[PDB]
Structure 1
Amino acid sequence: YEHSTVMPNVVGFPYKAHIERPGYSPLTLQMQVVETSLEPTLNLEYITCEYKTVVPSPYVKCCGASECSTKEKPDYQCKVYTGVYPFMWGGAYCFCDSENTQLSEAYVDRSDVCRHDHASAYKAHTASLKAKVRVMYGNVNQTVDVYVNGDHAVTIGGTQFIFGPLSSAWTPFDNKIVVYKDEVFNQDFPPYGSGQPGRFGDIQSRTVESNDLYANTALKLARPSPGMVHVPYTQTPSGFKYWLKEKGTALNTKAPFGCQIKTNPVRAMNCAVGNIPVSMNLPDSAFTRIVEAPTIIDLTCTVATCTHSSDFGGVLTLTYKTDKNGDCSVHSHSNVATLQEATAKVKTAGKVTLHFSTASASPSFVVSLCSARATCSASCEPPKDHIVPYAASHSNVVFPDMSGTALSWVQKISGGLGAFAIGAILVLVVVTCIGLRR
């Protein structure tokens, strides 16, 4: 046997799936989603960390001259100054009063520690989804992990389940993201080779082990003060610390739909959106013959109490006449109300009780017990507690049944007005026809 249905993608919301085929007793399936994870495919662009500046000891030449050649090194900056008079604790350094030359140079290299501490830039693509689903029926109660993409298939108790694909393709990450420790940020970053000093991306590297580095930090040297030995230099501070200071608001406290963001690997969990279609193939060993199952005749339904709340704030009583005691499958055939239990026990007494949850003021739904069906309509009152700590356990429906008190009132008003209008039309037609007869 083959079957297909759709379930809501809400973690913790029970689903009752009713499967009926002629010649076999109806079956009810309990399906729940315990966790869902959405992970995108990434392509690393670059990483960033703090830097350091290497300034080797300056070169001093007495009664001579020096000239420096360029070198392939990140932001190498060299200069030669004339007319310098170095001093130290022992006294003067050279004979020549004004024939000394000082050669200075400096460059920038990545921090020796920033292997542990770095921030990565990534580009986001289409994301795949995986989930964990709990299935209950008969003596089978098991939790399995599946891929919600329409390809992976699982087997439970000789039954084949196929999940997905998801109805709505929605992702919280934009095209470009930045990852640091355990937070992600949906921000645009400069492309490689075009970093600016003082902002994010002052130094760049293809990967953590790269031997190349692109830096732009405005290394400017200056002439040393007279009678001293030192290499002055002015340079804009590291942009990584600046970005760390005013990064902004992380996605963990801004992501919509109330789903949580985790890293290593980057993923979003419990993203409540859309609905999941499920297809299933069942064997013949999971059903029961009509002869073995009890027979229910003359089924009628009465409601006892109804208060539309988050929990199961509604109780009703079902009366029946049977021939032998046993177990039956109970289901609600409308989305307006949701039942709590799927299997009930029937005895010769002919009375059973059921609990249900609803949201509409005046719900009306068909309840099925084994092979028999009945209709139920109820009058409900709003609750009084304002804030509760558990999630809603009902599908949000508010439109009442046509038999509700308010709809009955509007129907009666419209009916009276329509009858009056029809009377006016008939009177005018009769008058004009009588006038035309002459």
Structure 2
Amino acid sequence: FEHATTVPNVPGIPYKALVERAGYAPLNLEITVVSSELTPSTNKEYVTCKFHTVVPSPQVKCCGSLECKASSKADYTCRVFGGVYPFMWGGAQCFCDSENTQLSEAYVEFAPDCTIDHAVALKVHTAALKVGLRIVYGNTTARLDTFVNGVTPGSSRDLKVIAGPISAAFSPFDHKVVIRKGLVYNYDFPEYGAMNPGAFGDIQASSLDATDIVARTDIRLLKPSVKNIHVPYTQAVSGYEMWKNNSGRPLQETAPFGCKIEVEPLRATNCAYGHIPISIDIPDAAFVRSSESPTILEVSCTVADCIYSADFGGSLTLQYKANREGHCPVHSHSTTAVLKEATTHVTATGSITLHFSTSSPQANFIVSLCGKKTTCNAECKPPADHIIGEPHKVDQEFQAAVSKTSWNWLLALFGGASSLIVVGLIVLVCSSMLINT
């Protein structure tokens, strides 16, 4: 049987319902999401790390001109110096006094320690929500992993489940993300090839082992001044360490909606947001005939010491006049109160205690012991514990968040004002009819 209903996406917090398929008995249905994996689609532009700036030996040649060539190496910088006369140890290196040519060559390379301390840059496109569902119907359980889009039921060995599109589309990732060492940051890195010096993305490559490495660090080769052979060069500071110095907090600690983000693959787990429209196809095997299911005649309610906390704060004694021994479900129709127990064992003329979690100051709700309806009506005290360590099982709806006596006084004032208005219009009508006569 196709049953469609809106359920919370929050992890835990069981959602219970009943199906009424004519004369096939009220059949219970407990569903609860236990995992919520939000996996976006990522493409990789570049990986970056601290660079090394390997500088080869100078090419000095003595009484000649040695203009250099271009190269495909990362951030190749060449300069040619005249009028040099270098000293290595043990004496001079040119037989020429003043006519010499020194070649200074400086490209840049990944550090040997970039196998770990490397950050990849990604763009996420669309968040795909995959949720795992625990279902118990009657006495049959089912673990089903389903995508939340409206199609692809997936695992249908016994049960068919369609997860409709979610009410609110939430994505904890911004359009550009950076992953280093298992930590994700919502950073706006530059495009591939748009390398600026002193900031993130100064050196880029598609992969760590790729020879196609690009960089635009401000490396400048200086004119050699001292007698001894070397290269003088001034470089802009690597923007990778500057980004590490002021990365802010990673997205595992700043993500909204209370969910935690893991890498390989990049996903967000247990994101509690919105409501999932669910559509279940309950098999007819679990359905039983209403003649076999015991019926019920008279049901009375008495709930004592209600408290509208997040816990199951309330005990109701519930009296029945049973027709026949048997186990059969129980359910509270009002969304404001949810029952701990889903199926009781009703035999003959007993009192059943039930635990319910509510959010209204008034406990005025409809409950079905194994069929029919029952109006539980009493009052609920405020919680004494200010902060509880578990989430609320009922969301407020403002239809019952105002207390019964508060509706009484507020509606009494409204009724007084409206009654004065009605008396005013009535006496205007009477006076108009009198002056018309």
The C-alpha deviation readout for 1:143-188, integer Å capped at 9, x for no partner, is: 2322222223255773322223323222122222222121112221
Q: Counterparts of 2:328 and 2:79 in 1: how far apart (Å)? A: 93
Match of 1:60 in 2: 60
Deviation at 1:417, TM superposition (A): 4.6
Match of 2:69 in 1: 70
**Secondary structure of the corresponding residue to residue 52 of structure 2:** strand
Match of 1:30 in 2: 30
CA RMSD of aligned residues (A): 2.3
What does residue range 257-268 of structure 1 map to in structure 2 within 5 Å? 257-268=257-268
Worse-superposed segment, 106-115 or 169-178: 106-115
What does residue range 318-397 of structure 1 map to in structure 2 within 5 Å? 318-397=318-397
Contact 1:68–1:78 (8 Å) recurs in 2: no
What does residue range 77-96 of structure 1 map to in structure 2 within 5 Å? 77-96=77-96
Contact 1:306–1:315 (8 Å) recurs in 2: yes
The C-alpha deviation readout for 1:380-401, integer Å capped at 9, x for no partner, is: 1111111221221222244438
Match of 2:131 in 1: 131
Using a 3 Å threshold, how does the CA distance of structure 1 residues 233 and 32 change in structure 2: closer, same or farther? Answer: same
Deviation at 1:341, TM superposition (A): 0.7
Using a 3 Å threshold, how does the CA distance of structure 1 residues 186 and 293 change in structure 2: closer, same or farther? Answer: same
Deviation at 1:350, TM superposition (A): 3.2
Q: Counterparts of 1:275 and 1:315 in 2: how far apart (Å)? A: 29
Using a 3 Å threshold, how does the CA distance of structure 1 residues 426 and 119 change in structure 2: closer, same or farther? Answer: closer
Contact 1:82–1:100 (8 Å) recurs in 2: yes
Q: Counterparts of 2:402 and 2:110 in 1: how far apart (Å)? A: 73
Match of 1:307 in 2: 307
**Secondary structure of the corresponding residue to residue 240 of structure 1:** helix
Give the alignment's TM-score, normalised by structure 1: 0.92
Deviation at 1:402, TM superposition (A): 9.1
Deviation at 1:52, TM superposition (A): 1.9
Using a 3 Å threshold, how does the CA distance of structure 1 residues 18 and 104 change in structure 2: closer, same or farther? Answer: same
Using a 3 Å threshold, how does the CA distance of structure 1 residues 60 and 210 change in structure 2: closer, same or farther? Answer: closer
Deviation at 1:403, TM superposition (A): 8.6
Q: Counterparts of 1:51 and 1:157 in 2: how far apart (Å)? A: 54
Amino acid at match of 2:118: H
Contact 1:331–1:367 (8 Å) recurs in 2: yes
**Secondary structure of the corresponding residue to residue 277 of structure 1:** strand
**Secondary structure of the corresponding residue to residue 243 of structure 1:** helix
Q: Counterparts of 1:15 and 1:29 in 2: how far apart (Å)? A: 8
Amino acid at match of 1:286: A
**Secondary structure of the corresponding residue to residue 305 of structure 2:** strand
Q: Counterparts of 2:366 and 2:94 in 1: how far apart (Å)? A: 107
Using a 3 Å threshold, how does the CA distance of structure 1 residues 83 and 135 change in structure 2: closer, same or farther? Answer: same
> Which structure 1 segments of 5+ residues have no match?
none
Match of 2:48 in 1: 48
Q: Counterparts of 1:419 and 1:83 in 2: how far apart (Å)? A: 107
Percent sequence identity over aligned pairs: 48
Q: Counterparts of 1:415 and 1:48 in 2: how far apart (Å)? A: 71
Contact 2:37–2:131 (8 Å) recurs in 1: yes
Deviation at 1:352, TM superposition (A): 1.7
Deviation at 1:256, TM superposition (A): 0.9
Match of 2:145 in 1: 145
Contact 2:144–2:155 (8 Å) recurs in 1: no
Aligned residue pairs, count: 436
Amino acid at match of 2:358: T
Q: Counterparts of 1:74 and 1:416 in 2: how far apart (Å)? A: 84
Worse-superposed segment, 39-48 or 414-423: 414-423
Contact 2:9–2:274 (8 Å) recurs in 1: yes
Q: Counterparts of 2:195 and 2:155 in 1: how far apart (Å)? A: 53
Using a 3 Å threshold, how does the CA distance of structure 1 residues 324 and 265 change in structure 2: closer, same or farther? Answer: same
Match of 1:231 in 2: 231
**Secondary structure of the corresponding residue to residue 394 of structure 1:** coil
Deviation at 1:368, TM superposition (A): 1.1
Contact 2:55–2:106 (8 Å) recurs in 1: yes
The C-alpha deviation readout for 1:66-103, integer Å capped at 9, x for no partner, is: 31221313333333333333334433444443334433
Deviation at 1:426, TM superposition (A): 4.2
